[PDB]
């Protein structure tokens, strides 16, 4: 996997997702500072998480619902919990939403995507 810099923590607005691609331009993802710590979250408040926005059920792009901190898929109504490492709350998928691993460098305050937990939709492997 490549080491793609996503942004500096300071630039992530509270619960305001920021788009980026990983591990390539055909794989759309989003990073978000949840506002309250969660396991696996990084950053000064351990609340920054990142996911592939494509639903692993059939590939539809998911939208981030700020009020519930969940990702919703409009195609067959599957919903993923951004605070539970992408756990599927309800839906037709058979896996958690692919989660992007972010390395946070305190010195530079940088956030670098360095891996993915799970398999992004529409590809034999994460790295094409």
């Amino acid at each position: 996997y490549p080491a793609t810099a996503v942004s500096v923590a300071k630039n992530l607005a509270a619960n305001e997702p920021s788009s980026f691609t990983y591990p390539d331009t055909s794989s759309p993802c989003v990073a978000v500072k949840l506002g309250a710590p969660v396991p696996g979250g990084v950053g000064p408040d351990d609340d920054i998480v990142a996911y592939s926005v494509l639903c692993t059920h059939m590939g539809c792009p998911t939208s981030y619902d700020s009020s519930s901190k969940t990702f919703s898929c409009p195609c067959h109504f599957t919903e993923f919990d951004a605070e539970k490492a992408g756990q599927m709350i309800c839906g037709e998928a058979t896996a958690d939403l692919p989660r992007v691993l972010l390395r946070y460098d305190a010195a530079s305050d940088a956030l670098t995507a360095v891996g993915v937990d799970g398999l992004i939709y529409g590809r034999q492997a994460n790295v094409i």
Binding site: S26, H57, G59, C60, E79, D81, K84, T94, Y121, A125
Partner: protein
């Protein structure tokens, strides 16, 4: 990472193992370590994996693949994906069917605990044994019981459904063994305590419960979902047929079929005390103005329909010419079911304006002159409701008066649970017997649970388990005391124990299950793919699921386990010099499941065949595995009208299109539907306790969780049965998501993790039924209707806080499951 199948990979057809919808799938099998190419012509999927696939191009994830190990020691990659060309699901896969590959047997996967050989309880634990030994003990006991007590000493609780753990081959096998050979009347069904139907009233009225096509849902002006949560329990029927109608995508089909007729935007009406994910999604798609949620008072369905019926009659919104020529008993029903909308509203709690709206959308003649086309779908909300027989009597009267059966776009049908696949000899008794009570009272020498787990699913289940566990402990002590005895001596020792209160228990399953707590013997069965299997779905579409792998160890098809039992009994009697007894066990000379298909389903109604009751009917002989395989996952809708080389199997889309019904005189029969309120037994708990204990399905969990219990993601999501509670009620009890509460009444006690749900009405709850950790059935009552159909949805109890479980709070999401 995922391994693609080479373009020449073996491909077989597979119907989903689980729900009634029966979605079509393909199974790809090829040697492990052999990989297809990324170029489209280089893989059996014909998909371009050289570059990112676009959205909706495929449904494929690691859980949909696996590596099985065949009996010859060879390892094969398998991939189970939905079939885009199947008209049922159009390529859609639900979260349950999507796991089929992960739940196929492998020695290292989710199914590694499958039964690979007969198992025996010895030395206070389970050990593998052989089929010869197992049959020696099993047939031995059944033989002694038959010779001393007759058939009434043999008890069974067996599936009567389709799909995995059922099917036309398996129901014929077990039925022929139970009813024709053994001849025991002591048999209940997997989901009901007696040998009865969930649809006695609708059938007696002339309307079998699966009388339309899934396409009728696309053609409907209005759809009623009664005591049904379709998005979670019949997912793809709801998604591939219902929603497209609401979205306006089926209007061209309506236009092509019906000339000179207006088609208002489709609307949907739910009769459910609870606001479910189905309601929420229906509102999200069609808008609130096109959805009517009649959130009735629990058990008041009969009052609702009597009120609607009275109203459509007063308004004249009925099909008089149809009532006149094809029905009997209309005037009597108008009198016996009379109920004003104000009385109806008082009883049901449903506003009068809403009652009027529902009737206006559904039955008031359209501007063009035709009555709307309204499909009435119903399931366990009223089947396991306040008097099964009366509610259907009330509902069907409404449907019949408004000609909503027999017209395309209509129909009053069950939504179903499991798929169907029934072929059996007639039940050998004249009386309905509540089996669970007979066992509790101590009747029977041997009990065999076949393809079911009543320890988690019977009504008033705590009473059953305590009793079975007690009667079983007696046999256990005796068996342990006789360690070192011969198989023949052990049979005598066991029989004696049953003469002193004991009960010998056998389980024919895919897994040990909770039944392993009481069982003395367990026999390994095989599911679809490890065997060939036929079954039909909710529109009577029969398909063949093809074998593509070997069953674990010596596991075998249920119909074949039945033959193995019958031949061991025949042989034991021959050796005992009893020729007549040996003779009644002939007829199971089968080598493959296909032989059962030929012996039952295909002989139905044919000359020289025994009495057979088959959903395939008397033209079932036209069906063969080869013709079904050629029909693909679309198969054919029963009943088959004919077959020819050019057109193949030709079927029937909708029943009753000529106004001829399944009754003596061919007319639909109206019935009286008296409103009696809740049953005394249920009312007593309601008067004594605080919460209504609603219970039922969860989208992701399949039944008793026999496979799910072994799946890491499912374990982490639902580590305990959950109970949906109103937030105000939670605050009062001082509980939050992940806390454990005890639920109880006079029938038993149970527990669940709290799931705060804003949509739950105060004083009401919803608990996941039949689970492995927290058995909801323990608080359900022993009340059943006239045919012994349980009111599983009618119970009340108190709830108290037990404590907190940090792990549940760490891993379990308690966010809303209602979309939007």
């Amino acid at each position: 990472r995922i391994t693609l199948p080479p373009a020449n990979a073996q491909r077989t057809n597979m119907t989903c193992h689980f729900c009634i919808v029966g979605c079509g799938y393909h199974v790809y099998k090829w040697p492990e370590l052999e990989e297809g190419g990324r170029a489209p012509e280089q893989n059996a999927l014909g998909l371009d994996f050289r570059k990112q696939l676009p959205p909706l191009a495929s449904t494929l994830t690691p859980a949909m693949t696996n590596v099985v190990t065949e009996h010859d020691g060879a390892r094969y990659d398998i991939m189970v994906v939905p079939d885009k060309a199947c008209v049922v699901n159009s390529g859609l896969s639900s979260t349950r069917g999507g796991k089929m590959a992960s739940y196929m047997y492998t020695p290292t996967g989710d199914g590694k605990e499958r039964l690979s050989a007969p198992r025996l309880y010895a030395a206070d634990e389970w050990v593998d044994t052989t089929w010869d030994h197992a049959m020696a003990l099993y047939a031995g006991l059944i033989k002694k019981t038959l010779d001393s007590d007759g058939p009434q000493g043999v008890f069974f609780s067996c599936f009567d459904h389709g799909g995995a753990g059922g099917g036309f081959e398996n129901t014929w096998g077990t039925g022929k063994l139970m009813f024709s050979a053994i001849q025991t009347p002591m048999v209940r069904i997997h989901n009901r305590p007696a040998y009865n139907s969930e649809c006695h009233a609708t059938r007696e009225m002339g309307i079998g419960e699966l009388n339309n096509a899934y396409e009728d849902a696309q053609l409907a002006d209005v759809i009623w979902s009664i005591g049904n949560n379709p998005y979670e329990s019949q997912t793809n029927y709801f998604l591939n047929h219902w929603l497209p109608n609401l979205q306006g995508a089926t209007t061209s089909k309506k236009k092509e079929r019906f000339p000179n007729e207006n088609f208002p935007q489709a609307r949907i009406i739910f009769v459910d005390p609870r606001e479910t994910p189905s309601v929420a999604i229906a509102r999200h798609v069609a808008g609130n103005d096109r959805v009517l949620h009649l959130a009735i008072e629990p058990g008041t369905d009969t009052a609702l329909f009597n009120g609607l019926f009275t109203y459509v009659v007063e308004q004249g919104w009925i099909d008089k010419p149809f009532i006149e020529a094809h029905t009997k008993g209309f005037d009597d029903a108008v009198k016996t079911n009379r109920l004003s909308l104000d009385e109806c509203s008082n009883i049901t709690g449903v506003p009068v304006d809403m009652l009027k709206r529902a009737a206006e959308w559904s039955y008031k003649p359209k501007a063009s002159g035709q009555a709307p086309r309204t499909m009435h779908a119903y399931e366990k909300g009223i089947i396991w409701g306040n008097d099964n027989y009366v509610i259907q009597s009330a509902l069907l009267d409404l449907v019949i008066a408004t000609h909503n059966v027999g017209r395309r776009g209509t129909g009053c049908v069950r939504m179903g649970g499991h798929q169907e696949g029934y072929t059996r000899p007639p039940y050998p008794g004249d009386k309905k017997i509540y089996i669970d009570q007979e066992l509790i009272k101590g009747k029977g020498r041997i009990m065999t649970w076949w393809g079911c787990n009543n320890f988690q699913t019977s009504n008033n289940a705590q009473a059953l388990r305590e009793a079975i566990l007690q009667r079983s402990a007696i046999v256990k002590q005796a068996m342990q005391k006789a360690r070192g005895a011969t198989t023949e001596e052990m049979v005598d020792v066991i029989y004696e124990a049953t003469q002193n209160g004991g009960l010998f228990v056998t389980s024919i399953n895919l897994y040990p299950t909770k039944l392993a707590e009481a069982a003395h013997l367990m026999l390994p069965a095989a599911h679809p793919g490890e065997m060939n299997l036929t079954s039909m779905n909710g529109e009577r579409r029969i398909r063949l699921s093809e074998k593509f792998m070997d069953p674990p160890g010596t596991a075998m098809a249920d119909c074949l386990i039945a033959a193995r039992i019958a031949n061991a009994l025949r042989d034991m009697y021959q050796k005992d010099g009893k020729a007549e007894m040996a003779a009644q066990f002939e007829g199971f000379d089968w080598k493959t499941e296909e032989d059962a298909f030929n012996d039952g389903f295909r002989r139905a109604g044919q000359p020289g065949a025994p009495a057979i009751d088959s959903q395939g009917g008397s033209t079932g002989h036209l069906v063969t595995y080869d013709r079904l395989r050629k029909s693909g996952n679309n198969g054919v809708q029963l009943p088959v009208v004919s077959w020819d080389e050019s057109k193949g199997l030709v079927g029937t889309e909708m029943l009753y299109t000529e106004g001829k019904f399944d009754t003596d005189d061919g007319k639909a029969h109206f019935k009286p539907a008296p409103w009696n309120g809740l049953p005394a037994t249920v009312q007593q708990q309601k008067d004594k306790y605080r919460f209504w204990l609603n219970n039922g399905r969860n989208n992701e969990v399949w039944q008793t969780a026999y496979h799910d219990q072994y799946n890491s993601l499912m374990q982490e999501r639902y580590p305990m049965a959950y109970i949906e509670m109103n937030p105000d009620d939670c605050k009062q009890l001082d509980v939050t998501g992940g806390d454990i509460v005890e639920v109880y009444n006079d029938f038993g006690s149970t527990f669940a993790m709290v799931y705060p749900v804003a949509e739950i009405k105060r004083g009401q709850t919803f608990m996941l039924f039949g689970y492995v950790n927290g058995i909801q059935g323990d608080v359900t009552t022993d009340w059943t209707d006239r045919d012994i159909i349980p009111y599983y949805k009618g119970t009340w109890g108190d709830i108290r806080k037990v404590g907190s479980m940090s792990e549940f709070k760490r891993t379990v999401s308690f966010k809303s499951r209602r979309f939007g």
